[PDB]
Amino acid sequence: KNIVPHIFKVRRYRKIATSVTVYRGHRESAITNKYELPRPVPLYEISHMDS
Amino acid sequence: KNIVPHIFKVRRYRKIATSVTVYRGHRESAITNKYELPRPVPLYEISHMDSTYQCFSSMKVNVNGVENTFTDRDDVNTTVFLQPVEGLTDNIQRYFSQPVIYAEPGRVEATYRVRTTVNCEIVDMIARSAEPYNYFVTSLGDTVEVSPFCYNESSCSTTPSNKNGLSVQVVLNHTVVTYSDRGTSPTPQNRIFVETGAYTLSWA
């Protein structure tokens, strides 16, 4: 009874949105990073981009 | 054929910078915590800090965008006494710089406060390696893909640090203070250091 797991390839698409908020006082660095919320790719629009 | 994994000890150094911004409305609490970026140590000054083991430089000035000092208004090369703290673990005598949360004034401000602090962290841990001894892991959970045996009648390490996203440094007669809590006078032995993306590992 073979036990080698089935293997294959896959392609994944992701959408990431992020912001930067660093100007505290006069000007600061890395004061507060945004939520960096990721989102799924658009249906058939990313496919058009994939096309 | 023996299967007991090779065991040894390791010492790690880290630099952490964090800020507290809580004065929302008039005065708020825990409005927004900073990124709390952990960073490696500058080796040379760190070695001097390691040699002192009771005086590590504060006010780290370092960032990918532009090196900026983050501290409680201190200087880059001035040192503070590391605090040997207790803990519930028989594998660590943790060593702290600035072991307290940032100032957090919480005064009457429109947006928030801007108080910030850094922290030099010196830790001792235990590392386990497999039979081939080409890579190993630490008790703290951090993983590294380098051979524990290197530059000791063996290849793959030298004094100049150069590797793919990694550093390979060997120091002869380094003579680590070997006791941060109570400075000692040990032998000047060799040692090897690696600077990671966020910290620095060290072992004999």
Q: What is the 3-state secondary structure (H, E, C) of chain B?
A: CCCCCEEEEEEEEEEEEEEEECCCCCCCCCCEECCCEEECCCCHHHHHHHHHCCCEECCEECCCCCCCEECCCCCCCCEECCEECCCCCCCCCCEECCCCCCCCCCCCCCCCCCCEEEEEEEEEEEEEECCCCCCEEECCCCEECCCCCCCCCCCCCCCCCCECCECCEEECCCCCCCCCCCCCCCCCCCEEEEECCCEEEEEC
For A23, nearest residue in chain B (alpha carbons): B114
CA–CA distance, B148 with B192 (Å, rounded to integer): 9
Q: Residue B97 in contact with residue B180, Cβ under 8 Å?
A: no
This entry's atomic model was obtained through cryo-EM
Residues of A in Cβ contact (< 8 Å) with B102: none
For A33, nearest residue in chain B (alpha carbons): B35
Residue with tokens 């100049």: B160
For A27, nearest residue in chain B (alpha carbons): B68
Residues of A in Cβ contact (< 8 Å) with B114: 24-25, 28, 31
Residue with tokens 């190993």: B136
User: How many other CB atoms are found less than 10 A from the CB of residue A46?
Assistant: 14
* B63 CB within 8 Å of a chain A CB: yes
Residues of A in Cβ contact (< 8 Å) with B65: 29-30
Residues of A in Cβ contact (< 8 Å) with B68: 29
Residue with tokens 């915590």: B33
| Nearest Cα residue to A19 out of A31, A39, A36 | A36
Q: Suggest the residue from B18, B23, B68 to mutate for an interface test with chain A (most A CBs closer than 10 A).
A: B68
Task: Report helix, strand or coil for B69.
Answer: strand
Residues of B in Cβ contact (< 8 Å) with A27: none
Residue in B21, B32, B37 closest to A30 by CB: B37
User: How many other CB atoms are found less than 10 A from the CB of residue B47?
Assistant: 20
* A25 CB within 8 Å of a chain B CB: yes
